């Protein structure tokens, strides 16, 4: 008993101890700002410090969707630059005297986020878990994506300074010790947004790891992955990312700039390497593409004829007011369009395309990109977003025309879609070019609510196989039949009624233009199929089943950004534990 | 007249309609044309100064300056093959000191 009592205590002081840690990634995306609360198992060992078991990372709460950072900033500018700064020269050096107020406005948003996080923590964690989490500190990574990637002047980066200071002064009452630093909390580039999502996917599907289960050191000392790493396509609110690893030794054109995971510090040296193509396209997100598509379609003569715009991507029988404003499908089957500029889906693009944004004012090529998409930078905002000579939009439900319009407008435009200097510098102007220049046998996973709803809808109505493998022509068929549907108002509201007595489903604010996304998918799969190499397969997924069976977390870039930091164990240990929250004193 | 020793050879060669960089990228075609290179013409033509027999010097510095200014230093479109500079946030020499300065 005594002889054990001693060895018990001896084991204790000689081995590693496990402890739970909270990690918060706040997604400052285009559509909203929201928390994602993760738990992770940390291990501290004698003389070895502390690190995270990456396979233990799991989401435990996705937060409420609060105001995106654009709102905060434009609301700031309204007050302090004066109403309608979108249409006038505004001297930017003057807005430095309103820094404190930017802070104030940001404080309002952050208090909601903090409280929401805390709510998730309190509800999900038992008392014992709480002790460990409150003790270790809680790293917070707040990263802005496409919603503010295009934002002009110095405002965005000033905002991030203030955001970090706010994250680093959490309310002491709840006892969770949030903190951040300029590496964790920052704008992330399009390619990073891609790469992290790529990392997330392959982590969760256990394709990417360092151990013998997921790696082989080859005869020649190079660590390989045992299964092929998989590429990802993510269509968000404002942008879409395309990412895929290159089959090894692909000779690329000198202009195509691929990223090497080790070389570029995305993953530590002990992980397998790869050169991966990662490009993100502004205007290709659901909301962005929605507004741009309308502006371009309905200022083309083929579709606008004496006030009426015939839209091949909207159902026969559907019709709506002619603007890019947010569409509410009402119970009585009408479509209400919100004229409030903020809720107008052209607002981002129209704002970027101001003649008073130095990005246009001094760069003619950017002016040209605006004009090519029917935004005239010299006009005031209201005009810029107005669809000229157009009263109503009527749906003609013609999928193939929809496809070819998505093709020339969005996927293969004459000029690159505006605010895409990043994509272009990688060597890619358009989605078109990505698969013309680089291509890979790497299987591809398609992600994003929109994209998924597109396939699910066709599946639900038995127009696609349950076991749909990515065959383009099969998809074009299903979409062709589906998008032919007639819209019928009934007592139970507006109804999408399928051809050949094939059934029905309610029309609502989310599915009314879903055919566009079907066209986007078809277009994208066609370009893929045309590439020199073609992906071994294609799938659509929302989350990946964990070892348990249930998913540990969502697809996206959230897990990736955590992994990007925590995987560099010495650097992380230094920042997360040595400096930690105690730095804020 | 040996093409290789012609100081337009690099730029003329980049501006080929058969170089994918131009062929697929209209913005690059525009940049070429703005500097009087037509990508669709064969090389000899591309490098040829049209309708010109001799160049006579007029030795006028200020005009030289303002011509350097609009041609090289502050061109309408960025001088071709400068996607790198442009992605840093700089299209022309002009803009460098307008945007950052030290
Ligand atoms: N089932 C669905 N059907 C149709 N549209 C959807 C569906 N789910 C979401 N959406 C739309 O797609 C977008 C959701 O993408 P989301 O990733 O939430 O945007 P975000 O991350 O804020 N923008 P980004 O900066 O590109 O990351 C929203 O703008 C929704 O309007
Ligand atoms: Mg996103």
């Amino acid at each position: 008993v005594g002889k054990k009592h001693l060895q018990t205590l001896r084991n204790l002081e000689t081995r590693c101890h496990d402890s739970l840690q909270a990690l918060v990634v706040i997604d400052a995306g285009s559509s909203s700002t929201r928390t994602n609360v993760f738990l992770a198992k940390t291990r501290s060992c004698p003389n070895k410090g502390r690190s995270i078991d990456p396979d233990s990372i799991q989401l435990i709460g996705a937060g409420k969707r609060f105001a995106g950072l654009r709102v905060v900033l434009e609301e700031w500018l309204d007050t302090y630059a004066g109403k309608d700064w979108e249409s006038r020269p505004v001297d930017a050096r003057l807005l430095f005297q309103y820094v404190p107020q930017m802070h104030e406005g940001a404080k309002k948003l952050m208090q909601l986020l903090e409280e929401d996080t805390v709510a998730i923590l309190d509800s999900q964690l038992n008392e014992k878990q709480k002790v460990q989490v409150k003790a270790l500190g809680i790293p917070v990574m707040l990263c802005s994506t496409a919603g503010v990637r295009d934002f002009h002047e110095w405002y965005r980066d000033a905002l991030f300074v203030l955001l970090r200071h706010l994250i680093n002064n959490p309310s002491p009452a709840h006892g969770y010790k949030f903190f951040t630093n300029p590496f964790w909390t920052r704008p992330i580039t399009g390619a990073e947004e891609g790469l992290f999502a790529f990392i997330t996917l392959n982590h969760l599907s256990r394709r990417l790891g360092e151990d013998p289960a997921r790696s082989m050191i080859d005869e020649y000392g190079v660590k390989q992955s045992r299964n092929d790493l998989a590429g990802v396509v993510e269509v968000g609110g404002a942008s879409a990312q395309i990412v895929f690893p290159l089959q090894e030794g692909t000779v690329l054109p000198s202009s195509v700039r691929a990223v090497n995971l080790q070389r570029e510090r995305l993953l530590p040296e002990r992980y397998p390497s790869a050169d991966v193509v990662s490009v993100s396209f502004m205007q290709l997100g659901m909301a962005s593409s929605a507004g741009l598509f309308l502006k371009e379609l309905c200022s083309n003569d083929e579709f606008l004829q004496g006030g009426i715009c015939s839209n091949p991507c909207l159902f026969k029988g559907f019709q709506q007011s002619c603007s890019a404003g947010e569409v509410e499908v009402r119970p009585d089957g009408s479509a209400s369009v919100n004229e409030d500029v903020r809720k107008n889906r052209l607002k981002p693009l129209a704002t970027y395309c101001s003649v008073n944004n130095p990005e246009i004012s001094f760069k003619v090529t950017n002016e040209m990109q605006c004009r090519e998409n029917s935004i005239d930078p010299t006009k005031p905002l209201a005009e810029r977003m107005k669809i000229e000579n157009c009263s109503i939009i009527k749906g003609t439900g013609n999928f193939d025309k929809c496809v070819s319009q998505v093709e020339s407008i969005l996927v293969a435009p004459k000029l690159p879609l505006p605010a895409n200097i990043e994509a272009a510098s990688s060597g890619f102007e358009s989605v078109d070019q990505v698969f013309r220049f680089a291509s890979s046998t790497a299987p591809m996973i398609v992600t994003g609510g929109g994209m998924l709803a597109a396939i699910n809808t066709l599946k639900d109505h038995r127009l696609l196989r349950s076991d749909f493998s990515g065959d383009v022509e099969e998809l074009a068929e299903a979409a062709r039949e589906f998008c032919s549907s007639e819209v019928i108002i009934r007592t139970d509201g507006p109804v999408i009624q399928l051809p050949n007595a094939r059934g029905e489903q309610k029309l609502n604010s989310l599915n009314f233009d879903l055919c566009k996304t079907m066209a986007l998918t078809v277009s994208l799969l066609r370009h893929m199929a045309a590439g020199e190499n073609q992906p071994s397969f294609i799938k659509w997924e929302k989350s990946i089943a964990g070892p348990d069976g249930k998913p540990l977390a969502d697809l996206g870039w959230q897990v990736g950004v955590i992994l990007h930091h925590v995987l560099f164990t010495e650097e992380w240990g230094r920042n997360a534990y040595e400096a930690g929250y105690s730095h804020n004193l």
Side-chain angles (χ1 to χ4, degrees), chain A:
Chain A
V1 176
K3 210 156 181 168
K4 165 164 62 192
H5 201 287
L6 274 189
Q7 197 181 12
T8 291
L9 288 183
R10 194 221 187 107
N11 296 338
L12 240 173
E13 51 176 36
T14 54
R15 56 193 179 205
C16 310
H17 291 150
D18 290 343
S19 189
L20 233 299
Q21 187 172 26
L23 304 165
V24 177
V25 174
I26 301 169
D27 194 322
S30 73
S31 75
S32 65
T33 305
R34 69 274 180 183
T35 36
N36 296 264
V37 182
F38 295 92
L39 277 191
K41 218 164 68 54
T42 73
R43 175 168 289 210
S44 71
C45 299
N47 282 293
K48 281 170 161 94
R50 186 186 299 273
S51 64
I52 278 143
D53 179 353
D55 298 297
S56 84
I57 300 155
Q58 68 156 114
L59 180 76
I60 64 162
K64 291 178 189 187
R65 295 184 155 245
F66 308 96
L69 297 182
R70 175 167 286 289
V71 179
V72 177
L73 286 158
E74 292 185 353
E75 216 214 337
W76 174 70
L77 284 177
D78 281 350
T79 325
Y80 298 101
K83 201 76 177 206
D84 191 14
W85 45 272
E86 289 104 329
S87 313
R88 302 180 274 119
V90 30
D91 171 30
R93 270 159 279 142
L94 281 162
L95 289 131
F96 279 113
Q97 65 180 284
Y98 311 109
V99 161
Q101 293 80 351
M102 179 190 268
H103 188 107
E104 274 313 298
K107 193 184 176 182
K108 290 185 162 92
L109 174 60
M110 291 303 311
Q111 284 197 276
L112 302 160
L113 290 155
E114 192 206 24
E115 183 183 33
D116 193 43
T117 309
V118 172
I120 284 151
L121 287 160
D122 282 337
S123 73
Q124 297 301 106
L125 297 174
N126 73 53
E127 277 315 316
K128 186 144 167 180
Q129 296 177 317
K130 271 187 189 145
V131 166
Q132 295 167 55
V133 165
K134 290 189 187 201
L136 290 161
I138 306 177
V140 177
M141 292 145 187
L142 191 155
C143 304
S144 66
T145 52
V148 166
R149 187 163 287 149
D150 60 340
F151 216 80
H152 58 303
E153 307 276 4
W154 52 266
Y155 312 128
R156 188 201 51 206
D157 303 320
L159 182 65
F160 267 82
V161 184
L162 305 175
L163 284 180
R164 284 185 224 109
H165 172 86
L166 289 164
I167 302 150
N168 279 304
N169 286 259
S171 171
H174 52 64
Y176 300 102
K177 286 155 187 172
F178 301 118
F179 69 108
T180 195
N181 67 45
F183 306 99
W184 305 347
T185 295
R186 57 168 183 85
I188 58 164
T189 58
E192 284 174 331
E193 188 180 5
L195 291 154
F196 296 148
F198 166 80
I199 283 164
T200 305
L201 164 70
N202 289 283
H203 173 71
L204 292 181
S205 65
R206 303 195 37 104
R207 284 189 194 272
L208 176 77
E210 66 171 290
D211 53 4
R214 297 114 111 187
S215 308
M216 61 206 173
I217 303 190
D218 62 37
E219 156 72 328
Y220 295 101
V222 167
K223 182 170 271 170
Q224 308 291 352
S225 180
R226 295 178 68 88
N227 308 285
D228 308 321
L229 302 167
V232 73
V233 171
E234 173 179 316
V235 179
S239 76
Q241 286 70 251
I242 297 176
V243 203
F244 52 89
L246 303 170
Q247 192 190 123
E248 192 204 77
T250 316
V251 211
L252 286 175
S254 288
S255 57
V256 169
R257 280 220 306 94
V259 174
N260 181 262
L261 296 157
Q262 279 46 31
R263 187 182 268 216
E264 271 69 71
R265 285 303 203 114
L266 263 316
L267 292 182
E269 298 271 64
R270 75 195 187 273
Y271 272 75
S273 205
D275 305 296
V276 352
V277 164
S278 184
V279 60
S280 160
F281 287 108
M282 295 283 298
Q283 324 317 323
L284 255 281
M286 298 298 294
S288 269
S289 63
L292 182 54
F293 190 76
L294 299 179
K295 192 78 160 114
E296 269 300 276
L297 191 90
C298 302
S299 75
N300 172 9
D301 305 5
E302 187 187 344
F303 302 94
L304 185 65
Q305 285 293 294
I308 309 168
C309 181
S310 294
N311 191 337
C313 302
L314 296 179
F315 295 101
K316 294 164 200 189
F318 174 83
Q319 60 157 44
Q320 64 157 90
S321 172
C322 191
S323 86
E326 202 158 80
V327 173
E328 203 216 0
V329 172
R330 285 191 167 245
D332 75 291
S334 67
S336 167
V337 170
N338 186 351
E339 278 314 307
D340 178 3
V341 298
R342 294 125 101 208
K343 296 270 190 276
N344 186 314
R345 294 164 305 171
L346 273 176
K347 181 85 212 313
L349 178 61
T351 303
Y352 170 74
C353 287
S354 180
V355 74
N356 299 295
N357 167 16
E359 214 59 26
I360 273 67
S361 166
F362 296 95
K363 308 186 190 188
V364 197
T365 37
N366 282 333
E367 178 175 342
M368 296 201 260
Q369 301 182 160
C370 291
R371 290 208 192 261
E372 281 298 292
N373 293 283
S374 298
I375 286 81
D376 182 343
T378 54
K379 288 179 168 67
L381 176 78
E383 285 201 34
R384 271 187 258 142
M385 308 197 294
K386 190 168 177 261
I387 301 162
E388 313 272 273
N389 301 123
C390 184
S391 318
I392 56 146
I393 300 169
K394 274 179 173 170
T396 56
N398 172 353
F399 186 66
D400 309 280
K401 262 196 182 167
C402 179
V403 163
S404 68
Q405 283 306 295
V406 162
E407 264 282 346
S408 62
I409 287 153
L410 296 175
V411 176
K414 197 202 175 197
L415 266 48
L417 300 176
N420 277 301
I421 186 68
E422 198 203 354
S425 75
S426 305
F428 309 95
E429 306 212 325
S430 64
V431 171
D432 156 60
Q433 293 175 353
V434 176
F435 305 102
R436 205 170 289 259
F437 289 166
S439 56
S440 178
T441 39
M444 294 294 301
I445 311 300
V446 175
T447 62
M451 303 299 276
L452 264 303
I455 308 302
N456 291 323
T457 306
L458 308 167
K459 273 172 182 179
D460 297 337
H461 288 256
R462 293 188 86 242
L463 296 159
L464 274 189
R465 276 208 153 59
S466 199
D467 50 298
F468 178 67
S469 51
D471 177 340
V472 207
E473 299 314 324
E474 184 174 338
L475 170 65
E477 270 287 65
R480 207 175 283 118
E481 183 80 21
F482 176 80
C483 296
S484 286
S485 298
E486 276 270 347
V487 167
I488 288 167
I489 292 160
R490 298 154 97 118
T491 296
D492 57 308
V495 155
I496 311 161
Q497 188 207 51
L498 275 71
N500 308 262
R502 293 246 194 196
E504 54 196 45
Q505 62 163 63
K506 262 163 296 182
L507 185 83
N508 53 73
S509 313
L510 277 60
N511 65 25
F512 83 94
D513 55 3
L514 195 76
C515 282
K516 169 165 158 283
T517 297
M518 303 188 182
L520 176 56
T521 304
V522 172
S523 165
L524 177 85
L525 293 175
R526 263 175 198 160
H527 283 274
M528 265 179 196
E532 184 156 318
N533 303 289
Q534 304 163 330
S536 56
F537 55 80
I538 305 155
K539 279 169 180 168
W540 288 254
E541 302 289 352
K542 183 218 183 136
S543 46
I544 294 301
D548 171 63
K550 257 138 197 160
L552 277 317
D554 275 323
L555 288 157
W557 57 261
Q558 296 70 31
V559 175
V561 65
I562 288 172
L563 277 170
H564 173 236
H565 286 111
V566 315
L567 281 185
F568 293 83
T569 79
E570 293 171 314
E571 195 185 88
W572 172 261
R574 265 187 283 269
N575 292 322
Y577 310 120
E578 304 205 23
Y581 51 97
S582 316
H583 192 67
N584 312 330
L585 288 171

